[PDB]
From Swiss-Prot, chain B:
It catalyses: kanamycin B + 2-oxoglutarate + O2 = 2'-dehydrokanamycin A + succinate + NH4(+) + CO2. One of its GO terms (biological process) is kanamycin biosynthetic process. Mediates the conversion of kanamycin B into 2'-dehydrokanamycin A during the transformation of kanamycin B to kanamycin A. SUPFAM superfamilies: Clavaminate synthase-like. The keyword Oxidoreductase applies. This is Kanamycin B dioxygenase. It is an enzyme of class 1 (oxidoreductase).
Amino acid sequence: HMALAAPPGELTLALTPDDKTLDPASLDRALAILAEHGILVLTGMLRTRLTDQLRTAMLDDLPEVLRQQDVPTNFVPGHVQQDPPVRESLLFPDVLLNPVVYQITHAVLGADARNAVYSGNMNLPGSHEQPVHLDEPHLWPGISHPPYCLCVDVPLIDFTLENGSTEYWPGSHVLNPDECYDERGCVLPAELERRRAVAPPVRFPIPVGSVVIRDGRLWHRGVPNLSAAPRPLLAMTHYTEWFDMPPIQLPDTVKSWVDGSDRHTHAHFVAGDVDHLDHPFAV
Amino acid sequence: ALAAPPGELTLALTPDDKTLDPASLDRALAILAEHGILVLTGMLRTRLTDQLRTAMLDDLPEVLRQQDVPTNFVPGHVQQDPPVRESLLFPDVLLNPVVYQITHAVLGADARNAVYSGNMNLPGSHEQPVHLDEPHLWPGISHPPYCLCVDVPLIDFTLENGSTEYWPGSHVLNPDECYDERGCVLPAELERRRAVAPPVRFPIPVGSVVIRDGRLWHRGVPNLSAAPRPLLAMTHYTEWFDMPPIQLPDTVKSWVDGSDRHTHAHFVAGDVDHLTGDHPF
Ligand SMILES: NC[C@H]1O[C@H](O[C@H]2[C@H](O)[C@@H](O)[C@H](N)C[C@@H]2N)[C@H](N)[C@@H](O)[C@@H]1O
Ligand SMILES: NC[C@H]1O[C@H](O[C@H]2[C@H](O)[C@@H](O)[C@H](N)C[C@@H]2N)[C@H](N)[C@@H](O)[C@@H]1O
Ligand SMILES: O=C(O)CNC(=O)C(=O)O
Ligand SMILES: O=C(O)CNC(=O)C(=O)O
Ligand code: NI
Ligand code: NI
């Protein structure tokens, strides 16, 4: 792997939280980066007011998560599946219904594209190396097809090479040779080494306030958090209208602003509070 | 306009044929890949097709009595679901082993039926526009099948009584600006294709099953006979294509839910209203 000191210029668009919309040139560069590299880093998108509250809420919940009988874990120890709270006080339009994110996902997936994931990845101190995998598979084996899902990753602290910044395989989102992927979405080692010689993977720091948009088929892995603090990531995934997904459970206290929107959510609205803490998204 | 299903699209079976030998299966898949439509004659016993025909003709008054009659594009092409009473749900229709052999090979072992509907073509019906029933998943992109329509004629289909018009090889066409919001083929693309590969209509004997790519161009045509022409329709989809479930009574849950021939089904206590969809839960 290549270990960098900052998000690479070729993958990165610098914004402020005042940027409500990408100008045509910025939008074209964003789509060109997603098409070629399968991953786009957008710095300076979210106010620290929002990331502070989500960070606090997830670190506060983590004891109750680790106290459960069977801790939902992705592939290897230390990579915990943890939903952020879905209390009305912690559901922010600028996170769920971000105008820049939906401008990008509308242009790639269509105006009918919808968020169907409001989850998270808590990377614990002493975590192991995940196998390289994709989060969502190609729809047929041996076939080239365009994207149908875009993962939207929101770091809730500064990500470093020390504390488990995700490893990404740029351009891997279009690879779909026969016999490449097992039932867990893990990449066959023979294909890993072939690809490594043409386009090796990258790990880079990502400052909090950033949003990472990537093809859901991009090869990546969680890596060891060698720090003394848990590394929280909030995770969302936009899908085409026609991809079967269970709905996100949300309280009907947010139905007024979620259900109205031209930024679609596959949501089921519940009277009272949802129990956000046996997870369907843990592999 | 032919006298019988063309040999190039057709496999002749008996109702005893539980499973195709590898060579027959390969020919079936080669026909679906190239032409997008496969006619399987002699698949269903007249015992089963008689009961479904009777049940649908008996229900048609309740359909025609509604304030707005659900109609496909033009007059005479009525949408009518067959009954989902336990006495009229047949494994050899819902869970046909030959159909699922073919749909498993094209769509995967996780492919599932998500449609149990029908098309009642009335005497004096109009010409439908050429359309597809299920669209391509992206505009301007070539991709493999994700759904297979399974059409079961409930009487002999003839050129006179509205045997469906099919456009062989049309299932792979997805150029930009080809399809309107109703899945109708834009006229300029219709005529371009007509010059390369014109459509076909042929009689189909009752007992037959037609399997076609859900993207195949086709149209309902006038029924110029004295009797309504009932068709029972099912559609197999990949596991990952979002569809509402078929409402079924839990009296069939034992044999439907067990099966390695998947159905996207919701099982209900008591009877389903198949015409209005207007049962309480
Ligand atoms: N990037 C978002 C999430 O992606 C993966 O989960 C997928 C999971 O891999 C899929 O099989 C499932 N259909 C959806 C689920 N969201 C990962 N396994 C999750 O840990 C991660 O939070
Ligand atoms: N071939 C099966 C059926 O195909 C069409 O209906 C489709 C319809 O065209 C699709 O948009 C929808 N997603 C499913 C629905 N079953 C037709 N409109 C129906 O009349 C017919 O019974
Ligand atoms: O959380 C991370 O950095 C990476 N995690 C995953 O890719 C996962 O758990 O599927
Ligand atoms: O019933 C027929 O012959 C054809 N009908 C249709 O294709 C339809 O209504 O979608
Ligand atoms: Ni992952
Ligand atoms: Ni049709």
